Amino acid sequence: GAMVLPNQMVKSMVGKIIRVEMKGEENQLVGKLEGVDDYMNLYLTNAMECKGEEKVRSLGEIVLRGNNVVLIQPQ
Amino acid sequence: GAMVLPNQMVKSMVGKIIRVEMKGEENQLVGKLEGVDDYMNLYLTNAMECKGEEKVRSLGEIVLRGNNVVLIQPQ
Amino acid sequence: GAMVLPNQMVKSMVGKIIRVEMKGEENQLVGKLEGVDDYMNLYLTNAMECKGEEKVRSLGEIVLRGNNVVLIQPQ
Amino acid sequence: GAMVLPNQMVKSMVGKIIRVEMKGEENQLVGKLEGVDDYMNLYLTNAMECKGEEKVRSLGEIVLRGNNVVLIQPQ
Amino acid sequence: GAMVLPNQMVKSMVGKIIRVEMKGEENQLVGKLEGVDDYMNLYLTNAMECKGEEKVRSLGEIVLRGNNVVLIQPQ
Amino acid sequence: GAMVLPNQMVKSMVGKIIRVEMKGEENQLVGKLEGVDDYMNLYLTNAMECKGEEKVRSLGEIVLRGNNVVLIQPQ
């Protein structure tokens, strides 16, 4: 039939708020997805470190390494 | 003789429910496989975080990074 | 002189029972190797989770991500 | 619309101070980004190991392996 | 001047006994290097699991995944 | 302006003593860099395992897997 490619899905999240779980991070990152590439490297702006709905640190602009991204969820 | 390629097997799971164990995740992810690519990145919909048959969190749409996928099992 | 390539060795295990240690798994996986690719992704059938000769969980069909495979041993 | 590629963002940080969280490191690295490549390997100069605003070790010149970089933040 | 490439060094170890430290393994692997490829996947024969000079498990034939190899040392 | 590529920096360390932190290693490796490749695999000679300025084990010749290298520092 048909299916939606992961890269297609992630690109559709550009300009929107997403939540990301990183392998080398205990808290999740929440911010606006400003850019992404085929290796799933992510560039977030207005980002913050969160533990669920609890904010723990303001980060602003950050770049996440794709091979260390575990899960991405539209917010 | 003959053999079934892993990528072939994973693609056959599209449209069906699968259980995934991630390297940077202590609980498994269960959801409908809506899309996958050659690097085994996975796009699940109607997903949930589970510990066996026990549901712990509703997630909805999520994208799993292929190099952090450990095991995939048809549900 | 001569040598046996790892990929050559793994392919020779197809159709046979193997034991696999995964980076993101504390127990080993034992099952029939039904398929493998150049990135060492593995497709096992009739698989089970074991701790040595002790069976802890029946799994059936599973796909193991190659970059998270640590060691493969013919059973 | 438009978006900023992660690699584009990281390159724009060259010549400036950045903070980096590594997967195999408990403390962050802070230093001047002197060079970077497409795999996000990083070359920092005048670097130091920090825990937030707390300096714990002087490092000087160091090269960080891209696949072990977790997060990069302009300082 | 000149230098010896890592892959060149590893290939020179073929046919000889080596000690390997794996990322997803607490004990080292010691065995005869029967084969290796450019991704540093390793095929050892007559292998054993060791903790220094202490043998803990006999393994025989095993294939080690290159990206999970940490250190290789001629024995 | 201009910048120094990480691979360029690492190659300039050939023939000199470097300190390396590995992801799957708790102690650092210190030795003479005899060879390196584009994936940052490293071949050290006269190497030793250290904890800062404290020597804990003599290693001699060792090959470090590039994707498990975390940080490299000229000694």
From TrEMBL, chains A, B, C, D, E, F:
One of its GO terms (cellular component) is ribonucleoprotein complex. Keywords: Ribonucleoprotein. GO terms for molecular function: RNA binding. Gene3D superfamilies: 2.30.30.100. The keyword Metal-binding does not apply. The keyword Zinc-finger does not apply. Transmembrane segments: none annotated. Residues 5-75 form the Sm domain. InterPro entries: Lsm7/SmG-like, LSM_dom_sf, Sm, Sm_dom_euk/arc. PANTHER family: SMALL NUCLEAR RIBONUCLEOPROTEIN (PTHR10553), U6 SNRNA-ASSOCIATED SM-LIKE PROTEIN LSM7 (PTHR10553:SF5). Belongs to the snRNP Sm proteins family. This is SnRNP, putative. It comes from Archaeoglobus fulgidus (strain ATCC 49558 / DSM 4304 / JCM 9628 / NBRC 100126 / VC-16).
